[PDB]
Amino acid sequence: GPHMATGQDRVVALVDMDCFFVQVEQRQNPHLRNKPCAVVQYKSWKGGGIIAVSYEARAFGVTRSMWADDAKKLCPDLLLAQVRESRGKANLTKYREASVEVMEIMSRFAVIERASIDEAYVDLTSAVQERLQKLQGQPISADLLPSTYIEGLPQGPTVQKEGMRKQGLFQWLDSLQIDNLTSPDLQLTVGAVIVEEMRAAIERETGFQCSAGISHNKVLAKLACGLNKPNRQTLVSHGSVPQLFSQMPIRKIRSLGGKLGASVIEILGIEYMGELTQFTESQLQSHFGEKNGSWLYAMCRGIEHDPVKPRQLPKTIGCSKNFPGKTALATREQVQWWLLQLAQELEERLTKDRNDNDRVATQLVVSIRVQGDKRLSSLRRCCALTRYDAHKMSHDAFTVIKNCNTSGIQTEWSPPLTMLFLCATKFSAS
DNA sequence: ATTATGACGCT
DNA sequence: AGCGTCATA
Ligand SMILES: [Ca+2]
Ligand SMILES: [Mn+2]
Ligand SMILES: [Mn+2]
């Protein structure tokens, strides 16, 4: 009872850009705004692979991973923007730089954890305490939450979406105890006021719209974010968790979308996150290991303690290229030329990184895939990274992989390489 | 022949 | 250290 921790100590948000690469291209090219459009890389093979899709195009059934020729079958008027190509490969610099724009704005409000190119977690606990004492016990107006959904509301004793949104918000605010500066629900609510402000600043200063989730931890914040996209934010309270989880497929929770989630379902004979509450912590630890068991036991009750890490910059800087089907690299000269292309982009990104961020990578990781191997990576070897020099980096990468060549004929490369990957790691301040 | 990434956990 | 898992545009 009185000693049962409820995982309500923190206010955590997850902010995630709507259709991000698409918005980046739409900002640049006004002709693409408010249209079914997608971002594609390469073109020769089946029109190129789609990697981002506007909400107008999703309405036609267009998705990520789709070939553009196939997408055009669903949506003949689909507009396309192509990822830049440099040194013979897709180059994602425009999107990385747009990401920095957004991350720097978010960082004005709080410490952030960069979680991907288009999203960050925010620990708003301190900021909330500040805003609360500023408010002086003043109630929170619905006007301060113009894009916020309260998950699970309205409930109990209008047929429009915005009307439903306002109805739930009214019920929520009607119920709040705004005179208790330690109420978790009030704290979340103030968190949501701050995220409205964060999201308004992002849109004002970049043109980009985003969604957000506000809860007590990262997993719930991430889940919440997706509940009402695009261009909206969702508050998931501790109290909303039982109903939310009662019909929530296990695979929807972050880290459970893969093999572990599949095993939870198979071994326990369940489908929904809520069904996990009926197992003891020891039971879950027996099936899924000590760490996962404890994590599952708390997570299904809406509790998780993973901190928002203070990290705005990526820990690694990498360059990779697949060489699929018949384009697999079969000659030493071929392997060396592409190692050089990768190494040249890597040097460019590393040099910019060193100037912007006062750090230097110290380790070069080289990874390849060989034709026929089921796995995404066949081999991963490291060597020292002592100078930002593309020719040296590619020569070194060749050295650490050159013995992988089955061929007695040195000029030939067998088995042919279906992937090359160069990654700079182990940064030190400089 | 989705591709190009990026973080973290295991042994 | 090298491998595997899970994730996102
Ligand atoms: Ca997104
Ligand atoms: Mn995202
Ligand atoms: Mn996505």
Experimental method: X-ray
Non-local (6+) Cβ contacts of A323 within 8 A are: A329, A338, A416, A417, A418, A419, A420
Tell me the CA–C1' distance in angstroms for A132 and C2.
Answer: 49
Q: Which nucleotide is nearest to A19 (CA to C1')?
A: C9
Looking at residue A355, its amino acid is: N
Q: What is the resolution of this structure in A?
A: 1.9
Strand C, nucleotides covered by protein (CB < 7 Å): 1-9
Looking at residue A145, its amino acid is: L
- Please write down the HEC assignment for all residues of A102-165: HHHHHCCCCCEEEEECCEEEEECHHHHHHHHHHHCCCCCCHHHCCCEEECCCCCCCCCCHHHHH
Strand B, nucleotides covered by protein (CB < 7 Å): 1-10
Within window 254-283 on A, which residues have Cβ closer than 7 Å to strand C? Answer: 254-261
Buried b (16+ CB within 10 A) or exposed e, A5-22: eebbebbbbbbbbbbbbb
| Alpha-carbon span A311 to A180, nearest angstrom | 32
Buried b (16+ CB within 10 A) or exposed e, A23-59: bbbbeeeeebeeebbbbbbeeeeebbbbbbbbebbbe
**Nearest to residue A274, comparing CAs of A295, A309, A250, A258?**
A250
**Nearest to residue A119, comparing CAs of A204, A12, A273?**
A12
How remote is the CA of residue A210 from the centroid of ligand 2, in Å? 10
| Alpha-carbon span A191 to A13, nearest angstrom | 8
Tell me the CA–C1' distance in angstroms for A137 and B7.
Answer: 41
| Alpha-carbon span A186 to A178, nearest angstrom | 6
**Nearest to residue A241, comparing CAs of A7, A3, A1?**
A7
Tell me the CA–C1' distance in angstroms for A17 and B11.
Answer: 37
> What residues have their beta carbon closer than 5 A to ion ligand 1?
A 16-17, 20, 118
**Nearest to residue A18, comparing CAs of A208, A199, A221?**
A208
A302 and A385 Cβ atoms separated by less than 8 Å: no
The answer to whether some atom of strand C lies closer than 7 Å to the beta carbon of A316 is: no
Cα of A357 vs its chain's centroid, Å: 22
Q: Which nucleotide is nearest to A328 (CA to C1')?
A: B1
| Alpha-carbon span A74 to A62, nearest angstrom | 7
Residue positions forming the annotated binding site of A for Mg(2+): 16-17, 118-119
Neighbours of A231 (CB within 10 A): 13
| Alpha-carbon span A21 to A95, nearest angstrom | 6
Tell me the CA–C1' distance in angstroms for A116 and B7.
Answer: 9
**Nearest to residue A175, comparing CAs of A340, A326, A183, A255?**
A183
User: Alpha carbon of A420 to those of A309, A378, A415: distances in Å?
Assistant: 30, 10, 13
Burial of A136 (0-12, 13-18, 19+ CB in 10 A): exposed
User: Alpha carbon of A179 to those of A134, A138, A185: distances in Å?
Assistant: 13, 8, 12
**Nearest to residue A226, comparing CAs of A259, A203, A248, A205?**
A248
A235 and A214 Cβ atoms separated by less than 8 Å: yes
| Integer Rg of chain A from CA | 25
How remote is the CA of residue A211 from the centroid of ligand 3, in Å? 12
| Alpha-carbon span A258 to A353, nearest angstrom | 33
Instruction: Locate A306 and state its tokens.
Output: 């993973």
Non-local (6+) Cβ contacts of A144 within 8 A are: A193, A196
Q: Which nucleotide is nearest to A261 (CA to C1')?
A: C6
> What region, left, alpha or beta, does residue A391 occupy, with left being phi > 0 and alpha being psi -120 to 50 degrees?
alpha
Burial of A214 (0-12, 13-18, 19+ CB in 10 A): buried
Tell me the CA–C1' distance in angstroms for A116 and B6.
Answer: 7
How remote is the CA of residue A265 from the centroid of ligand 3, in Å? 24
- Please write down the HEC assignment for all residues of chain A: CCCCCCCCCCCEEEEEECCHHHHHHHHHCHHHCCCCEEEEECCCCCCCEEEEECHHHHCCCCCCCCEHHHHHHHCCCCEEEECCEECCEECCHHHHHHHHHHHHHHCCCCCEEEEECCEEEEECHHHHHHHHHHHCCCCCCHHHCCCEEECCCCCCCCCCHHHHHHHHHHHHHHHCCCCCCCCHHHHHHHHHHHHHHHHHHHHHHHCCCEEEEEECCHHHHHHHHHHHCCCCEEECCCCCHHHHHHCCEHHHCCCCCCHHHHHHHHHHCCCEHHHHHHCCHHHHHHHHCHHHHHHHHHHCCCCCCCCCCCECCCCCEEEEEECCHHHCEEEHHHHHHHHHHHHHHHHHHHHHHHHHHCEEEEEEEEEEEECCCCCCCCEEEEEECCCCCHHHHHHHHHHHHHHHCCCCCCCEEEEEEEEEEEEEEEEEEC
| Alpha-carbon span A325 to A304, nearest angstrom | 44
Residue located via tokens 């109805």: A167
Within window 80-119 on A, which residues have Cβ closer than 7 Å to strand C? Answer: 116-119
Longest alpha-carbon distance in chain A: 80
A415 and A378 Cβ atoms separated by less than 8 Å: no
Residue positions forming the annotated binding site of A for a 2'-deoxyribonucleoside 5'-triphosphate: 64
Measured N-to-C along each axis, helices A281-288 and A290-299 cross at an angle, to the nearest 10 degrees, of 130
Phi (first) and psi of residue A74, to 5 degrees: -85, -30
Tell me the CA–C1' distance in angstroms for A51 and C9.
Answer: 6
Q: Which ligand is nearest to the CA of A20?
A: 1
Instruction: Locate A208 and state its tokens.
Output: 């980009």
Tell me the CA–C1' distance in angstroms for A22 and C9.
Answer: 9
**Nearest to residue A100, comparing CAs of A127, A83, A120?**
A120
Instruction: Locate A153 and state its tokens.
Output: 């509301």
User: Alpha carbon of A70 to those of A48, A49, A81, A187, A212: distances in Å?
Assistant: 10, 10, 16, 47, 31
| Alpha-carbon span A367 to A373, nearest angstrom | 13
Instruction: Locate A316 and state its tokens.
Output: 């690694």
| Alpha-carbon span A10 to A306, nearest angstrom | 11
Could you identify the residue whose CA is nearest to the C1' atom of nucleotide B1? A324
Could you identify the residue whose CA is nearest to the C1' atom of nucleotide B8? A255
Q: Which residues pair with A86 in a beta bridge?
A: A89
For chain A, list the domains and their CATH numbers: 1-18+89-249 (3.30.70.270), 19-88 (3.40.1170.60), 250-307 (1.10.150.20), 308-430 (3.30.1490.100)
